[PDB]
């Protein structure tokens, strides 16, 4: 009886598998996932951009990037607030870079940014991007703190 | 001892079969499934029917059928916007049925509807039904696009 | 054979295992929750106190508990509604204590409350409490029917 159980473990085991896959389906679908798109998910929480990087990479996910228009707008309306992107410049000065790797294609700046300011008084200058209400970006202090939008793959 | 291992295993997966069981019911209460009722759940995406049917499907649901006022009101406010329901005549012009079978018992048709329409000059007349934010029916084209609310049993 | 495909059915077991975990952190992630905070979730259902508790429990979380302002305020946008709270008087008239056990380290009494009114015509006094308009308390009859929201550990 011992390859009888073995196999019917076996089978828990696969039908267990492919419930949980259902059940990530179910939930991204009713979290806002498009067919054959990017989904981006938030709760609504400001932190310093290392604490975003952090809580979405322990979500198996990454920092909200977007790389078009339409992302871009799919994202502010998942924010609703000031949020980061994964778009840094701590690497190189004046070069962005996606968190996760290769120069910035698309960009979608407000007027007169980036400026790399010192301003704000919170050491250094702005080597992370946010994007504000109307969808632009802006670079600002990753010490600041800002909503959390994590990005999981199409 | 291997049928000792594989006992504690067989534990192991029965947790874990608990455990899943568990998610699902806190993913559905999140989602608003209320006791003894029949869940509704979109992604607010717009799109033909075919697909409307072809994502529920896959989700293991069906396209959203509403079977009397409470549910109508239900499904109304999951979709927030104008959505289709699983109901055609497709097959027999004035005939309509649910996409699980039978005919059409309960409707609340706006006033003036069905009137299988045409002159969207698209694709035949209005094969599809729908439901506007005012929570009644309106027969259309099955080739526009509406919100996708897919039901999942009580 | 045997003892490598008991092998691997471990390693298929305890991958299931953390993947089940990670599913349960996104989810309470798009549910709102905040680092290292607890937090509420509701279906938005009216039912009698009993309901709440049973349903809370079955959900292995508990009925929602504001243990001060920033909470009681969390509960209050969650629920959106008149919700009810994890707190009673039913074992000692006159004596609110947590459903969780112990006395109360925070208060957020509306003037003229709680009164234990039988005016309600559904017999007994008040021993239960619901969270009104203002964020502000009220003790209420346990049979009356309000928004069950549960909470779930930081
Ligand atoms: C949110 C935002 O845009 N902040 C910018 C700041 O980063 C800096 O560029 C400053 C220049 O004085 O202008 C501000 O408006
Ligand atoms: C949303 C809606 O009701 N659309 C209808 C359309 O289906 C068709 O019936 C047309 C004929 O006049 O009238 C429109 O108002
Ligand atoms: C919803 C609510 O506040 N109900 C209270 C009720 O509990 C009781 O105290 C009554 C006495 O008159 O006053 C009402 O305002
Ligand atoms: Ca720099
Ligand atoms: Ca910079
Ligand atoms: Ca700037
Ligand atoms: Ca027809
Ligand atoms: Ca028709
Ligand atoms: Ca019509
Ligand atoms: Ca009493
Ligand atoms: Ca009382
Ligand atoms: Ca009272
Ligand atoms: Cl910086
Ligand atoms: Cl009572």
Same mark, same amino acid.
């Given at each position: 009886?011992?390859? $009888?159980?073995?196999?019917?473990?076996?089978?828990?085991?696969?039908?267990?598998?492919?419930?949980?896959?259902?059940?990530?389906?179910?939930?991204?679908?009713?979290?806002?996932?498009?067919?054959?798109?990017? /989904? /981006?998910?938030?709760?609504?929480?400001?932190?310093?951009?290392?604490? $975003?990087?952090?809580?979405?990479?322990?979500?198996?996910?990454? $920092?909200?990037?977007?790389?078009?228009?339409?992302?871009?707008?799919?994202?502010?309306?998942?924010?609703?607030? $000031?949020?980061?992107?994964?778009?840094?410049?701590?690497?190189?000065?004046?070069? /962005?870079?996606?968190?996760?790797?290769?120069?910035?294609?698309?960009?979608?700046?407000?007027?007169?940014?980036?400026?790399?300011?010192?301003?704000?008084?919170?050491?250094?200058?702005?080597?992370?991007?946010?994007?504000?209400?109307?969808?632009?970006?802006?670079?600002?202090?990753?010490?600041?703190?800002?909503?959390?939008?994590?990005? /999981?793959?199409?």
């Amino acid at each position: 009886a011992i390859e $009888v159980k073995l196999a019917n473990m076996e089978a828990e085991i696969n039908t267990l598998k492919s419930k949980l896959e259902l059940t990530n389906k179910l939930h991204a679908f009713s979290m806002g996932k498009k067919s054959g798109k990017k /989904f /981006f998910v938030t709760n609504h929480e400001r932190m310093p951009f290392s604490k $975003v990087k952090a809580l979405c990479s322990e979500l198996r996910g990454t $920092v909200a990037i977007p790389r078009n228009a339409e992302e871009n707008k799919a994202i502010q309306e998942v924010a609703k607030t $000031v949020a980061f992107l994964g778009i840094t410049d701590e690497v190189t000065e004046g070069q /962005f870079m996606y968190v996760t790797g290769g120069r910035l294609t698309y960009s979608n700046w407000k007027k007169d940014q980036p400026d790399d300011w010192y301003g704000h008084g919170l050491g250094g200058g702005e080597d992370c991007v946010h994007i504000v209400d109307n969808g632009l970006w802006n670079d600002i202090s990753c010490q600041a703190s800002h909503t959390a939008v994590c990005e /999981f793959p199409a």
